[PDB]
Design a protein around this nucleic acid. Structure first.
Ligand SMILES: [K+]
Ligand SMILES: [K+]
Ligand SMILES: [K+]
Ligand SMILES: [K+]
Ligand SMILES: [K+]
Ligand SMILES: [K+]
Ligand SMILES: [Mg+2]
Ligand SMILES: [Mg+2]
Ligand SMILES: [Mg+2]
Ligand SMILES: [Mg+2]
Ligand SMILES: [Mg+2]
Ligand SMILES: [Mg+2]
Ligand SMILES: [Mg+2]
Ligand SMILES: [Mg+2]
Ligand SMILES: [Mg+2]
Ligand SMILES: [Mg+2]
Ligand SMILES: [Mg+2]
Ligand SMILES: [Mg+2]
Ligand SMILES: [Mg+2]
Ligand SMILES: [Mg+2]
Ligand SMILES: [Mg+2]
Ligand SMILES: [Mg+2]
Ligand SMILES: [Mg+2]
Ligand SMILES: [Mg+2]
Ligand SMILES: [Mg+2]
Ligand SMILES: [Mg+2]
Ligand SMILES: [Mg+2]
Ligand SMILES: [Mg+2]
Ligand SMILES: [Mg+2]
Lengths: 117, 327, 50, 128, 132, 567, 101, 16, 49
RNA sequence: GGACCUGGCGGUGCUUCAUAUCCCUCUAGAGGAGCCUGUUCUGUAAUCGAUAAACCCCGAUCAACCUCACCACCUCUUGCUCAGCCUAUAUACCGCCAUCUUCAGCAAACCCUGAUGAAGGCUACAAAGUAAGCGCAAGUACCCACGUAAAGACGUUAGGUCAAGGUGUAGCCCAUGAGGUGGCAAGAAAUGGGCUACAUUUUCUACCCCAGAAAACUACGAUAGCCCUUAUGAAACUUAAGGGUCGAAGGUGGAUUUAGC
């Protein structure tokens, strides 16, 4: 019988407490216990018991986490998105001034849903 | 030798957390605390537990109604049930001289209280309550019977009746909780002034689905406007007008204030009730403190909690059942 | 990004409906389900198309 | 229909009928009893009737230092794989049928005199 | 007595996961949903199609990773992306998991005409919440 | 965002059980995933009716089944063109013969489009999912070409390019003569192939080959044909054989590109780099060729122009290691990090070779504090290290007198698939046991030596009889003594006799000092008993030490007398 | 491979009803006004009555798509009450929970 | 019971 | 499209890439019924002839 | 046969009880009329299931065709399906439930007493019980900590459902399978539930509560009958809505009985 495969240690043990976290979760991704260096627990505990640990925790997998949208990341993201924006006319200070120069208002709605269509 | 089915699997047992385990759980929480602070771009040194709970709620948003089922990152002391560490050392000798009672913490407390009662002899209500049994079961970190709790309370009462000194008073207060004695005294709305300088107060009231907002003027002639209409034109039913009279009449102030109120929702009676409550609360700004307590005791400042009960499936109404078919 | 934003929470909507509990008969015994739709409204003003 | 199919656990729980008014009071007796069989036991992921050889799933990924390509066992060699699985199935059934008997007690139907082995080891590493 | 999705008490020897241990009335109270999409929100369409797809994906993954799934699937839809998050065991060789991930992601992307990704978390054994 | 250094590449499953733990698994895990994709595509294309329901809006053309079969079954020209687009060499030939026998006219443009297909694949079928010279002497391409009624310039060009592609260099030059006899003009792509054939047709001295090529280039100027990048890149690629003779001629090609206006690509410098990097002393010339090539390429973003553009960085790093120039290696790596230049590193084999030569040069010529920053940034994030780089790293720690990191290198070595490498475990043990250290370090070395000992005991070679090198046993034993785990050291002495491995003199002397501390005469005799078995000269002198140092019981004295009898 | 023969008949009715929808719509328009002559509307009555019976949309039945149950179906999910509950009670229907109030 | 009633390790990183 | 789903998964089972526990269960019940003599008759060769 | 234990039972003792409940007491009903609807019975060539509590506007949040599983006639045979079967068996089952439950108990691991008998295990100024699991409880949802939901174990009724689907066993395979056409789905009756009434606290109109008329054989009272329109549909004496006509029983209902804090 050949030796069975050993799982490596979680790479959270190699993470420094002063790292650039946005590089770990750059985009929306499911919760990964081996990559999130937090002793977070979730689950209604049993009597005289603790909430279940993160490893194999389906409740933490069910959450739409915001690990990819930390305040540090959002601020870095928007610094790169400033080059894409344009400046609102300063003359249009109030709604009454907009109505004077732009008397027509056009309303349209876009709908974002999840699915193939 | 022979094989019999085994009693059980050792994993199928109550989990005991050795002191070494808690020691390493605290090292993980301190490292994770600095990671979480780095994630949010905050100073790791001044990162508090309130910031942790805020950061965990943002990063792991859970709408589960039971908060105990939501993501949590707390200090192990708070998380793990604080079952006392092994109550003996390596040599097997228990640390506490009352170990073999099985209730060393409870009986150590009874022993200390009984000893104080002895020393006093040799020498010789509304504000707070006694702690509940579940609060004693946490100070001691043991399970208690109901009669165990009573005996301890009977022993503390026996200690107050004595000429207890300062040392015997700090001890009893450890088991007296600060009862939530927020007074029943009604909160008085501030007195505002309009453009013309006329003093008035404003309050709100709810009855069933009706919601009212009333402005009671400090001085007036007894005029009441409901949605811009005279109260007797808005409320042609004599009972609805009596409800508007009730607050002012009870404090002897008919013909002394002007009221302009707005009410929406509900029926005619519910709207009269909502206006009654709104006017009474606003009127409390212009009466003496004793008069405000009399209005409270007359039922003029309490929101009526009686609302329609939902219909249940399988029965005709909220309480009425379908006819039990003839057998 | 320098955009003026206001936020408020419109009232939630709860859609409830009733279903039979048993596969067969026992009409008076039902199971009721609901879908809760909660809302948040971000209102941005005075921004260009880009 | 694919959507009307259930799992093996659901299928065996129904077919075996171990929970029920028959099994509550032993109202039903079992000279002939449905016996649970694990049908995933000798099954290899990647093996199918067509005899395809998927590199990295049921055959080695690399052969002679080169990545293998999709291949299909010929009818003759596929026929021998199926036959070998049938024999392995009846062989597995035969081995299970064989069991070592235990010496009787004072009489064939009596419990008296039968050995139960040593007492179980105590919690504190105690042994008997 | 209610039966729906209730692991009934035994003799204290049946290991159950967190999901299996919670009856339906605890859904949204102690346990979340196993699929998240917009079809069941007020004013949203295509709930029927999203539901059929979920039933297929659960059966497809059960038979595609036979004996490997250690818990129910978590299905996430964002835009036209479909994310399948599964907790699996550590018995199959890693080569077979990569083959099945590449195979399943490709086949499901062509079947439902959307980019499909499979996220696997391995556990040494089924995580036990309690012994009923 | 930047690269996550604690993670393996994004293509792998981010899970401790599924993450690759070695360079071998890094390659094989991706091949298994690609195999799964191929199996799905094979199924999708074999059973397309299951995958034809399109619920996507907007339509996704790339998620529909592919149809590789011709759908026109009529015999006509417009049906042949379909089989040519699908690249059906046999079907297109058969359809062309039948169409010809019937006497219908087949256009010239279509006849050429048929040659381009045959001449490219050589009358062979391209690879599919599932159902020397290669210019076959009996080939449809030449036959159709001969039977062809009217032949234009393009017809010859596709025949000449196909011959050279399949190594029919001699035939292609003969065909280039007819093209000229027929008053035709070839294109640059034909000339590119003829330059390749001129060099590979026959083996001759450089001067002869260099005179023919210059004749092709002058012919290309007579025919008003302008050379492209591949024209000059083929000259430099073909001059690799001549090495020293072609060094200055090759530099004449580069200077010509600059003047004409063609821009040298990464391949143009890869070929020059390989030509000048001949076995020998590179300092004479290779030094200033690479220094000038990098000053030119400094801060330039590159675009793909030649198929050999993904080989420059591997070649350039190979010289930086040879020259042992770390400043140049940083410039080469700096070029790889500017813009999107990182995509020119090459396949996985080229990526691992580049980083092996790059890191091995850092460990050698760089400070250890910076070396350990690259070790964290590159491994495993950029590549998985070979066992020889783990050794090159230990040699760097030794030179820096930082041996407290050895236990970490062993932990990492196991995580990279080097648990059972003999050269590595011996290297680690020898450094740890080379000299004595403070008690804190010595204890750490004994926890690592214990873990190494476990590796020797549980090897996958356990199928074979366990093999313990002599140095490993001596080092592991010495490390236990110096740590105070004397019980573990005494047990190991049996393994010297079981495997018949000579004990080291230092180990025997340290055992005596551990006995005199414990005042155990039997153990001291057990030491003299061991050295006596191997007939070591120190034993006879050691027996004298044991007598004086330890009280000798009558049984022990007779035991020594028995060994004295052997003496 | 449909659940049963009854689901298969409805599948065919939905396919034939879709194929004749435009033709039936156009003929019906002639019958659903007081503008055209009765002589023309009487002919249109006969024409739509002669179309295949399974082209008529009132014969389509909303059956459970997984069990073919003809009643107790929730239109939004196209599932019978039993099948819907099975999925809902296992937390497999996004956003659906037991209702208490 | 008398019939019989019979119903009859090391781990490595980067194994092979 | 119940045809697509049933036919696709049936094809994937024959290719060895999908394990149909239900079908495996039915195949074992059908196998043991032959050994018990309860085999399906040939069309036209039913018990009534 | 003797002694004892447990259970069951007693036309057995005493004691305290039920809180919208066992009885009285409170309010509105059912039981009488018409009508609607279920069931039974009868009828018919013409389904099935539920059917004391715990069936009876129940499976159906629903039958003109379809649905449909029924009847008659005709037609097909490797059959939408690597067939099919709403064929028998819920007394083989899973699944989902009724019921006590408007309950508080259930099942393990140990320990101790009875001489190591069947058995038993509580006393708080305490005398052998105890560390855990399930239910209750807690917590959660709704407007609170109240209430209402939800929850409610084990077990009881071989309770209900093979016709949701799946499935064990047995049976059919030119037929017990599949398809088409047309058709049944009624009332001599009995009975359950509901609706509308019998009126003056009413009827009609205006208004939404300060009005004017009506008020007994032209009043109250049909959502019934008949006739005609319209809506839906391919199809309507048939289903629904509206109008016209008609103006019946009914004059507040015995025993008995339902619901509500
Ligand atoms: K008795
Ligand atoms: K009545
Ligand atoms: K049952
Ligand atoms: K069934
Ligand atoms: K059956
Ligand atoms: K009635
Ligand atoms: Mg009512
Ligand atoms: Mg119930
Ligand atoms: Mg016998
Ligand atoms: Mg219909
Ligand atoms: Mg009646
Ligand atoms: Mg009936
Ligand atoms: Mg019946
Ligand atoms: Mg029955
Ligand atoms: Mg009954
Ligand atoms: Mg019909
Ligand atoms: Mg019909
Ligand atoms: Mg039939
Ligand atoms: Mg039953
Ligand atoms: Mg609440
Ligand atoms: Mg409550
Ligand atoms: Mg309830
Ligand atoms: Mg409760
Ligand atoms: Mg029965
Ligand atoms: Mg059936
Ligand atoms: Mg038939
Ligand atoms: Mg009248
Ligand atoms: Mg009428
Ligand atoms: Mg009409």
């Amino acid at each position: 019988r050949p030796p069975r495969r050993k799982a490596l240690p979680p790479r959270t043990e190699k993470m420094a407490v002063d790292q650039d976290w946005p590089s770990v979760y750059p985009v929306a991704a499911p919760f990964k216990p081996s990559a999130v260096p937090l002793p977070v627990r979730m689950g209604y505990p049993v009597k005289k018991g603790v909430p279940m640990a993160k490893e194999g925790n389906l409740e933490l997998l069910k959450i739409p986490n915001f690990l990819h949208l930390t305040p540090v990341a959002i601020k870095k993201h928007c610094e790169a998105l400033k080059d894409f924006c344009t400046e609102w006319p300063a003359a249009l200070d109030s709604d009454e001034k907009c109505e004077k120069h732009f008397p027509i208002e056009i309303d349209s709605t876009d709908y974002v849903s999840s699915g193939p269509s | 030798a022979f094989v019999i089915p085994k009693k059980n699997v050792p994993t199928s047992k109550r989990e005991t957390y050795t002191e070494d385990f808690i020691k390493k759980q605290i090292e993980e929480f301190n490292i994770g605390k600095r990671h979480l602070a780095n994630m949010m771009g905050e100073d790791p040194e001044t990162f508090t537990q309130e910031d942790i709970d805020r950061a965990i709620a943002y990063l792991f948003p859970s709408g589960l109604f039971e908060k105990r089922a939501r993501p949590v990152m707390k200090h192990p002391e708070q998380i793990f049930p604080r079952q006392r560490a092994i109550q003996w050392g390596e040599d097997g000798r228990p640390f506490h001289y009352l170990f073999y009672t099985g209730k060393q913490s409870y009986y150590s407390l009874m022993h200390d209280v009984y000893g104080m009662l002895l020393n006093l002899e040799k020498h010789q209500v509304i504000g707070s309550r006694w702690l509940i049994k579940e609060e004693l079961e946490e100070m001691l970190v043991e399970k208690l019977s109901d009669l165990d709790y009573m005996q301890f309370i009977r022993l503390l009462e026996k200690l107050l009746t004595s000429q207890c000194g300062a040392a015997e008073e700090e001890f009893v207060q450890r088991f007296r909780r600060s009862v939530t004695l927020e007074s029943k005294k009604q909160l008085i709305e501030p007195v505002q002034y309009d453009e013309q300088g006329m003093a008035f107060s404003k309050s709100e009231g709810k009855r069933k689905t009706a919601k009212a907002e009333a402005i009671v003027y400090k001085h007036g002639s007894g005029r009441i406007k409901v949605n811009g209409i005279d109260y007797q034109l808005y409320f042609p039913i004599t009972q609805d007008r009596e409800q508007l009279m009730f607050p002012f009449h009870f404090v002897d102030r008919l013909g002394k204030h002007d009221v302009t109120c707005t009410v929406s929702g509900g029926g005619r009676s519910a709207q009269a009730g909502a206006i009654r409550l709104a006017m009474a609360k606003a009127l409390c700004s212009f009466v003496t403190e004793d008069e405000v307590e009399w209005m409270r005791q007359a039922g003029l400042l309490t929101t009526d909690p009686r609302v329609r009960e939902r219909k249940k499936p399988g029965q005709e109404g909220a309480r009425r059942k379908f006819t039990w078919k003839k057998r | 990004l320098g955009i003026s934003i206001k936020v408020h929470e419109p009232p939630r909507k709860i859609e409830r409906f009733t279903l039979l509990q048993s596969v067969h008969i026992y009409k008076k015994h039902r199971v009721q389900y609901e879908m809760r739709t909660l809302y948040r409204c971000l209102e941005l003003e005075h921004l260009t198309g880009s | 229909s694919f959507f009307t199919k259930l799992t093996a656990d659901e299928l065996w729980k129904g077919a075996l009928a171990e929970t029920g008014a028959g099994a509550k009071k032993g109202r039903g007796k079992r000279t002939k009893k449905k016996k649970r069989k694990d049908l995933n036991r000798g099954q290899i992921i990647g093996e199918g009737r067509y005899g395809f050889l998927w590199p990295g799933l049921n055959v080695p990924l690399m052969k002679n230092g080169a990545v293998q390509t999709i291949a299909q066992r010929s009818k003759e060699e596929q026929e021998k794989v199926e036959a070998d699985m049938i024999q392995q199935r009846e062989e597995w059934d035969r081995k299970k049928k064989m069991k070592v008997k235990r010496e009787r007690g004072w009489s064939g139907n009596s419990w008296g005199g039968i050995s139960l082995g040593p007492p179980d080891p105590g919690p504190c590493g105690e042994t008997y | 007595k209610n039966r729906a999705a209730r692991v009934r008490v035994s003799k204290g020897d049946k290991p159950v996961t967190y999901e299996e241990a919670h009856a339906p009335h605890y859904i949204a109270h102690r346990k979340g949903w196993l699929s998240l999409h917009t079809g069941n929100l007020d004013g949203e369409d295509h709930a029927a199609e999203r539901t059929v797809e979920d039933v297929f994906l659960r059966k497809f993954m059960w038979g595609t990773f036979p004996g490997c799934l250690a818990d129910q699937l978590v299905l996430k839809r964002r835009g036209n992306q479909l994310e399948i998050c599964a907790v699996v065991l550590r018995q199959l060789s890693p080569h077979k998991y990569y083959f099945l991930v590449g195979y399943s992601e490709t086949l499901l992307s062509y079947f439902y005409k959307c980019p499909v990704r499979l996220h696997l978390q391995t556990v040494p054994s089924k995580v036990v919440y309690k012994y009923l | 965002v930047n690269r996550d250094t604690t993670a393996v590449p994004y293509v792998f499953q981010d899970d401790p059980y599924l993450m690759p733990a070695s360079s071998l698994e890094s390659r094989s895990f991706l091949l298994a995933k690609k195999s799964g994709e191929n199996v799905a595509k094979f199924i999708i294309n074999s059973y397309p009716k299951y995958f034809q329901k399109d619920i996507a809006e907007p339509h996704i053309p790339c998620l529909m089944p592919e149809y590789f079969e011709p759908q026109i079954k009529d015999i006509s020209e417009a049906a042949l063109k379909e089989r040519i687009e699908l690249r059906k060499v046999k079907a297109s030939v058969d359809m062309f013969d039948q169409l010809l026998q019937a006497g219908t006219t087949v256009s010239l443009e279509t006849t050429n489009s048929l040659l381009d297909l045959l001449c490219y694949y050589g009358d062979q079928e391209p690879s599919t999912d599932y159902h020397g010279v290669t210019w076959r002497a009996k080939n449809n391409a030449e036959r159709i070409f001969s039977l062809m009624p009217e032949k234009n310039e393009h017809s010859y060009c596709t025949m000449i390019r196909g011959m050279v592609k399949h190594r029919a260099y001699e035939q292609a030059l003969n065909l280039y003569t007819e093209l000229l006899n027929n008053r035709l003009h070839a294109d640059v792509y034909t000339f590119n192939a003829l330059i390749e054939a001129t060099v590979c047709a026959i083996n001759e001295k450089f001067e002869e080959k260099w005179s023919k090529i210059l004749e092709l280039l002058r012919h290309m100027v007579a025919q008003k044909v302008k050379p492209n990048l591949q024209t000059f890149n083929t000259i430099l690629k073909c001059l690799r054989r001549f090495h020293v003779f072609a060094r200055s001629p090759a530099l004449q090609v580069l200077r010509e590109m600059k003047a004409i206006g063609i821009e040298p690509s990464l391949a143009t410098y890869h070929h020059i780099i390989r030509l000048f990097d001949q076995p020998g002393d590179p300092l004479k010339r290779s030094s200033f060729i690479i220094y000038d090539i990098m000053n030119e390429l400094m801060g330039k973003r590159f675009s793909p122009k030649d198929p050999d553009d993904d080989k420059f960085f591997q070649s350039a790093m190979s010289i930086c290691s040879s020259l042992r120039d770390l400043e140049l290696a940083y410039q080469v790596h700096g070029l790889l990090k500017t813009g999107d230049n990182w995509k020119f590193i090459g396949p996985d084999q080229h990526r691992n070779f580049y980083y092996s030569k790059f890191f091995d040069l850092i460990c050698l010529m760089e400070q250890i504090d910076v070396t350990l920053k690259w070790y964290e940034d590159l491994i495993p994030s950029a590549y998985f290290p070979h066992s020889q780089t783990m050794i090159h790293l230990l040699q760097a720690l030794d030179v820096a007198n930082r041996l407290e990191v050895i236990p970490k290198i062993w932990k990492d070595s196991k995580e990279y698939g080097h648990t059972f490498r003999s050269d590595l475990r011996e290297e680690i043990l020898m450094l740890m046991a080379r000299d004595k250290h403070p008690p804190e370090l010595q204890v750490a070395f004994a926890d690592c030596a214990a873990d190494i000992k476990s590796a020797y005991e549980s090897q996958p070679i356990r199928q074979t009889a366990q093999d313990w090198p002599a140095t490993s046993l001596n080092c592991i034993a010495i490390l236990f003594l110096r740590a105070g785990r004397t019980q573990e050291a005494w047990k190991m002495l049996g393994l010297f006799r079981k495997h018949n491995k000579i004990p080291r003199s230092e180990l025997l002397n340290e055992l005596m000092d551990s006995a005199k501390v414990s005042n155990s005469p039997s153990q001291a005799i057990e030491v003299v008993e061991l050295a006596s078995a191997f007939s070591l000269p120190i034993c006879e002198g050691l027996t004298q030490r044991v007598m004086s140092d330890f009280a000798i019981n009558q049984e022990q004295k007779e035991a020594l007398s028995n060994l004295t009898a052997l003496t | 491979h449909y659940v049963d023969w009854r689901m298969w008949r409805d599948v065919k009715r939905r396919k034939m009803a879709y194929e004749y929808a435009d033709e039936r719509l156009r003929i019906n328009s002639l019958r659903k006004n007081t503008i055209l002559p009765k002589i023309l509307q009487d002919v249109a009555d006969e024409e739509i009555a002669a179309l295949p019976r399974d082209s008529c949309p009132v014969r389509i039945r909303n059956r459970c798509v997984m069990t073919s149950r003809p009643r107790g179906v929730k239109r939004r999910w196209r599932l019978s009450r039993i099948v819907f509950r099975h999925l809902a009670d296992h937390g497999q229907l996004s956003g659906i929970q037991r209702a208490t109030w | 019971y008398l019939s019989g009633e019979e119903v009859e390790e090391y781990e490595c990183y980067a194994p092979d | 499209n119940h045809h697509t789903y049933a036919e696709l998964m049936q094809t994937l089972r024959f290719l060895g890439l999908y394990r149909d526990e239900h079908q495996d269960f039915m195949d074992e019940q059908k196998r043991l019924k032959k050994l018990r003599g309860k085999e399906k008759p040939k069309k036209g060769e039913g018990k009534r002839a």
